[PDB]
Every structure is written in structure tokens, then in C-alpha cells.
Amino acid sequence: VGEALEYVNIGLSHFLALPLAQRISLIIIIPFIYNIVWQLLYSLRKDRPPLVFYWIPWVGSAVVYGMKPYEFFEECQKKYGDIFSFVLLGRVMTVYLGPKGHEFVFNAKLADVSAEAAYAHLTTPVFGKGVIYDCPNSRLMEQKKFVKGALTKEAFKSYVPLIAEEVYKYFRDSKNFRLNERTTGTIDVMVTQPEMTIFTASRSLLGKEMRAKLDTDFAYLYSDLDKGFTPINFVFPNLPLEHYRKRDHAQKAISGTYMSLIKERRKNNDIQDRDLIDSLMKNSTYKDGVKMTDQEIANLLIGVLMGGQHTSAAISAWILLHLAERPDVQQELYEEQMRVLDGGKKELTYDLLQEMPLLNQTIKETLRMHHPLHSLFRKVMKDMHVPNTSYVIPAGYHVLVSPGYTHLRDEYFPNAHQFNIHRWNNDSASSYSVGEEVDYGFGAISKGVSSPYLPFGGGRHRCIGEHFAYCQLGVLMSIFIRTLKWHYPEGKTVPPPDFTSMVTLPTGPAKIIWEKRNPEQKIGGRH
Ligand SMILES: CC[C@@H](C)n1ncn(-c2ccc(N3CCN(c4ccc(OC[C@H]5CO[C@](Cn6cncn6)(c6ccc(Cl)cc6Cl)O5)cc4)CC3)cc2)c1=O
Ligand code: HEM
Numbered sequence: 001v002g003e004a005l006e007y008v009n010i011g012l013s014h015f016l017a018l019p020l021a022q023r024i025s026l027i028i029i030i031p032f033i034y035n036i037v038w039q040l041l042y043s044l045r046k047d048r049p050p051l052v053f054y055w056i057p058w059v060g061s062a063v064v065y066g067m068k069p070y071e072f073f074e075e076c077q078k079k080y081g082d083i084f085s086f087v088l089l090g091r092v093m094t095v096y097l098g099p100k101g102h103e104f105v106f107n108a109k110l111a112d113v114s115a116e117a118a119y120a121h122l123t124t125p126v127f128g129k130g131v132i133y134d135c136p137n138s139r140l141m142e143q144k145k146f147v148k149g150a151l152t153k154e155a156f157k158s159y160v161p162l163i164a165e166e167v168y169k170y171f172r173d174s175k176n177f178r179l180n181e182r183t184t185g186t187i188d189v190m191v192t193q194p195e196m197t198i199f200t201a202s203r204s205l206l207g208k209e210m211r212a213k214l215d216t217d218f219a220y221l222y223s224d225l226d227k228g229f230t231p232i233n234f235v236f237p238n239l240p241l242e243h244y245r246k247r248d249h250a251q252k253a254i255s256g257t258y259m260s261l262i263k264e265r266r267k268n269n270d271i272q273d274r275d276l277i278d279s280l281m282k283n284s285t286y287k288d289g290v291k292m293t294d295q296e297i298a299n300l301l302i303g304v305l306m307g308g309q310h311t312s313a314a315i316s317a318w319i320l321l322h323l324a325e326r327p328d329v330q331q332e333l334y335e336e337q338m339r340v341l342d343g344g345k346k347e348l349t350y351d352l353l354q355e356m357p358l359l360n361q362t363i364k365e366t367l368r369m370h371h372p373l374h375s376l377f378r379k380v381m382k383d384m385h386v387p388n389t390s391y392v393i394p395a396g397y398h399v400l401v402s403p404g405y406t407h408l409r410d411e412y413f414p415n416a417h418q419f420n421i422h423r424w425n426n427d428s429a430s431s432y433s434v435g436e437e438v439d440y441g442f443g444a445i446s447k448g449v450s451s452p453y454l455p456f457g458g459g460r461h462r463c464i465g466e467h468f469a470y471c472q473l474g475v476l477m478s479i480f481i482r483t484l485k486w487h488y489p490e491g492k493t494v495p496p497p498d499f500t501s502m503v504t505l506p507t508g509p510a511k512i513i514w515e516k517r518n519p520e521q522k523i524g525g526r527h
Pocket of ligand 1: 304306
């Protein structure tokens with residue numbers, strides 16, 4: 001009876017007097033044992049979705065999920081159906097696949113889930129404080145409104161010639177091309193596209209000064225800042241190491257430069273309508289009267305530029321890679337250019353961009369096959385019951401949604417792993433609210449998010465960058481197509497995606513060989 005409790009205390013005491021060898025081994029064994037025990041008991045619960053079994057505690061299914069998340073999702077879906085959890089480096093991720101999954105996560109009430117609690121630890125160090133995910137959602141909603149205010153049809157009309165100019169400059173000056181000197185060459189598209197993207201997006205969103213500053217050793221700070229933008233930071237945001245310091249330094253130095261330009265313009269009253277900076281200078285007052293600081297303005301510009309950097313660089317990379325084994329498509333895109341721009345005797349404008357459906361379909365189809373963000377997350381804040389199920393997702397869990405996975409299902413996109421731009425005949429718009437709409441603070445967007453095609457997400461956290469992305473990728477590709485033909489080195493094909501990077505970029509080196517359609521044509525201007 002009571003002799004039992006004595007031997008508990010005795011057994012407790014003999015424990016701590018075990019040989020240290022057996023002691024260190026014990027400290028490994030019993031959480032291992034317990035984990036299996038706990039998993040097995042968890043399986044009983046009918047108000048929890050299935051949990052993918054894992055051996056190593058805490059680590060969970062991290063390695064298999066990290067390397068091939070869609071193959072992992074496919075497997076889990078065969079066995080368990082569309083709702084299932086899995087452990088990932090100390091967190092419980094509840095996946096919900098398919099259009100119902102989109103509905104569950106993207107249209108989750110503000111009360112139930114938090115994007116900032118899922119994302120802030122990565123982004124805040126990189127972008128800086130007070131903006132995006134380092135603030136309440138209603139602040140974010142309004143920051144998105146402010147940014148959108150520089151992303152208008154008239155802005156795109158003026159961006160097009162500037163982006164065009166940057167792309168031509170790059171063909172002229174970059175070692176990777178130099179078209180006034182070489183008629184053919186080889187490039188790594190994972191070198192060329194990040195540079196082309198930063199050059200074109202700096203010039204148009206940030207302006208001529210911030211573009212100019214890229215022709216200096218200031219450019220090294222973007223590289224530094226970029227290295228804090230990696231998934232590692234989702235779990236180790238701050239570690240006393242050098243690249244964590246090069247990041248912190250870069251955020252300060254880059255934001256300082258933007259603040260310098262901003263304060264400079266206010267000084268001379270040079271606030272026009274040129275770029276996103278001008279725009280945020282005129283329009284960054286919240287509905288409660290608080291103005292964003294010059295520091296928050298600058299931090300937001302870093303965020304925006306960083307966001308648009310990696311998604312677009314990735315996509316232009318993939319477009320080049322898919323087109324390299326598809327001279328039929330290159331030929332077809334080339335004809336559309338000849339028709340819409342009168343054999344090239346018409347200058348590219350934003351309006352004419354809208355009359356190039358095949359081009360835009362190519363972007364659309366590349367966005368389907370290569371969603372740059374394979375997993376979007378939220379942290380669960382209030383217990384969530386899953387509709388038409390017994391399941392309840394408790395606070396402290398995370399939900400994971402993956403439209404990119406659905407993009408690659410034959411059920412919704414017949415022959416989903418074939419690149420086919422003609423599957424978007426009669427549907428070349430970047431996206432569009434198929435029905436009723438809703439405004440979270442940054443404009444009216446689709447109310448339903450059940451579309452199997454969701455390259456830009458949906459709900460309150462929806463992308464506001466899609467028309468800029470289409471504008472930028474569209475001018476870029478229009479010119480690539482008109483200027484060059486390109487193909488793979490012998491025996492090379494489309495590389496598989498890297499799923500461990502921030503975006504699903506191509507696995508390197510991803511090389512193509514280009515050649516000038518007109519070996520004799522020259523790009524003017526000085527260099
Ligand atoms: C350790 C073992 C190894 C095998 N392993 N184990 C696990 N993993 C792993 C897991 C998951 C992932 N990732 C990939 C990246 N991913 C992700 C990245 C960015 C992201 O961004 C969401 C928010 C914040 O950033 C932006 C991105 N963006 C959207 N449009 C443009 N960019 C964002 C929004 C707004 C602004 Cl202003 C800027 C930015 Cl960057 O949206 C969401 C998910 C999460 C899963 C990678 C590796 C591994 O590598
Ligand atoms: C091909 C290009 C891009 C794709 C496919 C893409 C995709 C996405 C997706 C899926 C989301 C939602 C994330 C989530 O719900 O967790 C998102 C959010 C967002 N993106 Fe993009 N993006 C692209 C480019 C851009 C560009 C160019 C900009 C700015 C110019 C931008 C700015 C933003 C912003 C401000 C948000 C809101 C984040 C939030 O509300 O939490 N993106 N994007």
C-alpha cells in the first residue's frame with residue numbers, strides 16, 4: 001500500500017545515482033520511448049486529424065517534408081486523406097490539401113489564426129521593425145493599401161519603358177550577355193535572373209537613385225541582407241554568427257540609404273509621383289492618424305523589394321528553363337510579338353502588354369507548375385473545429401496550406417506535370433474573382449478562395465504584387481523573346497525544384513545557351 005510510495009522515492013533516488021554512461025543513454029531513451037507511446041495514444045483521439053508517424057522526437061518529419069514536400073503530401077494524402085498533421089522541428093503542422101484546404105486557411109477568421117506569429121521571426125530581422133509582420137494585422141492591411149497605391153495602371157504604364165530600359169542595359173553591359181560583342185553565349189539563369197530582377201524592380205519601384213546605387217559596392221549589402229532571408233531563420237532567427245551580423249548591418253545600412261533619400265526629398269520638397277518612395281511619402285497615414293516613420297517607410301520598402309525579388313527571379317528562371325526545350329512555344333510567343341508590335345515597329349507599352357495573351361499564359365502556366373511558395377503557414381490562436389469532420393485543431397498548432405500542390409494535381413489540371421500554355425486559352429488574366437468580393441483594408445478581392453489555382457493566395461494575406469509581377473515578367477520576357485532564341489546544352493533538361501530554399505527556385509546550375517535572333521542588331525547608349 002504505502003510501501004509503494006516509499007519505493008517510488010527510493011527508485012527516484014537510485015535513478016540519479018546511475019552510472020553517467022547509463023545516465024546520458026537514459027536521457028536519450030525515455031523521450032524516444034515516450035514519443036512513440038504518445039504518438040500511439042494520440043492516434044486514439046477522434047477530434048484530432050491523423051498524425052504522420054515519426055521516429056526522432058522534435059525533429060519530426062522535417063527532413064522528408066523539407067526535401068520533397070509535394071511527394072510527402074501525396075503520400076500522406078493517399079493514406080490519410082486531405083487533413084493531417086505532422087511534427088516539424090518542435091511544431092505541429094496541420095496540413096489541409098485541396099480547395100477546401102484553401103478555404104480553411106486563407107479565409108480563416110482573424111481571431112482563429114495569425115500569419116505574423118508564423119512569419120515575424122524570419123522577416124522582422126530582415127525587413128526591420130514596425131512593418132509587415134512586426135505589427136498588428138490592421139497595420140499590415142493598411143501598409144498593403146499604401147503599397148498598392150503605387151501599383152496602379154498608370155504606374156505600370158510608366159514602369160514599362162523603365163523596365164524595358166533596364167533589360168536592354170543588362171543585355172548590353174552584363175558579362176553574361178554583352179550582345180554588342182557576342183551573338184551567342186551560355187548563362188546560369190540563377191545568376192542572370194536575380195540580377196535582372198533586382199535591376200528592374202529597383203529602377204521602377206525604388207527609383208533612379210536606388211537603381212544607380214546598385215552600380216556601386218552598396219550592392220554588396222543587398223547580398224548580405226539576402227542571406228538572412230532563408231528558412232533557417234524560421235527556427236533560428238538570431239544566432240551570434242557573422243552572417244546574422246552582416247544581415248543586421250545590411251538592414252541598418254540599406255534602410256539608412258532609403259531614409260537619406262526620403263529626408264532629402266522632403267528637404268527640397270521633391271516629392272513627385274515617380275516611384276514607391278514618392279508614393280509612401282505622400283500616403284502612409286493610418287486611419288487612426290498615426291504616420292509611418294521614415295524608418296518604417298524604409299523597412300517596408302525592403303520588405304516589398306525582398307518579396308518581389310525572389311518570387312519573380314524564380315519565375316523568370318523557370319520560364320527560361322521551360323522555354324529552352326520548347327522552341328515551338330518560343331516560336332509561337334515570337335509570332336504574337338510580331339503581330340502586336342507591328343514587326344517590332346511599335347514600342348512596348350503596358351496596354352500592348354495586355355494584348356499578348358500567350359505571353360501572359362506562359363507566365364500563368366509557369367506560376368502553376370512552379371508556385372514559388374510551396375507552403376503558406378499560420379499559427380492557430382483559437383481552437384478550430386474542421387467543418388464536416390470530428391476534428392478540432394487546438395491553439396498552438398499550425399495550419400499549412402499548399403495551393404502549389406493542387407496546381408500539380410491531374411484532377412484539376414489534366415496532365416499537370418506537362419507545361420502547356422494553351423491550357424489557359426480563354427483565361428489568360430493573372431487571376432480574377434470568379435464571383436463575389438470582400439475588402440480587408442487594401443481593396444476588393446475574391447471572397448471565395450476555393451479556386452484550385454491560387455498562385456497569389458487569398459483572404460486578408462493575399463498578394464498585392466501580382467500585376468507588378470506580371471508587368472515586370474511581361475516586359476522582361478517580351479524582350480527576351482524578341483531578342484534571343486535559347487536552348488539547353490546537349491542532354492540537359494528542366495531541373496527539379498529546390499524545396500529547401502525560400503522560394504521553389506530551380507536546382508543548379510541551370511544553364512541555357514542563347515543566341516541573337518539578329519546577331520547584327522546593336523543596343524545604343526553609353527557604357
Ligand atoms: C533541416 C532539415 C532540412 C531537410 N529541412 N527541414 C525542413 N526544411 C524546410 C522546411 C520548409 C521550408 N520552407 C520554404 C520557405 N517557406 C516560406 C517562405 C516564405 C514565406 O513567406 C510568406 C510571407 C512572408 O514573406 C512573404 C513572401 N512573399 C510573398 N510574396 C512575395 N514574397 C512576403 C510578404 C510580404 C512582403 Cl512585403 C515580403 C515578403 Cl518576403 O510572404 C512563406 C513560406 C516555408 C517552407 C524550407 C525548408 C528543410 O530544409
Ligand atoms: C510571381 C510573383 C509572386 C507570387 C507568386 C507571390 C505570392 C504571394 C502569396 C502566395 C502570398 C500570400 C502569403 C500567405 O498567405 O502566407 C503573398 C503575399 C504578399 N505578397 Fe506576393 N507574390 C509575388 C510577388 C510579389 C510582389 C512583386 C510583391 C510586391 C511588389 C509582393 C508582395 C506581397 C505582399 C505585400 C503580401 C502580403 C503578405 C500578407 O498580407 O501577409 N509579392 N504573395
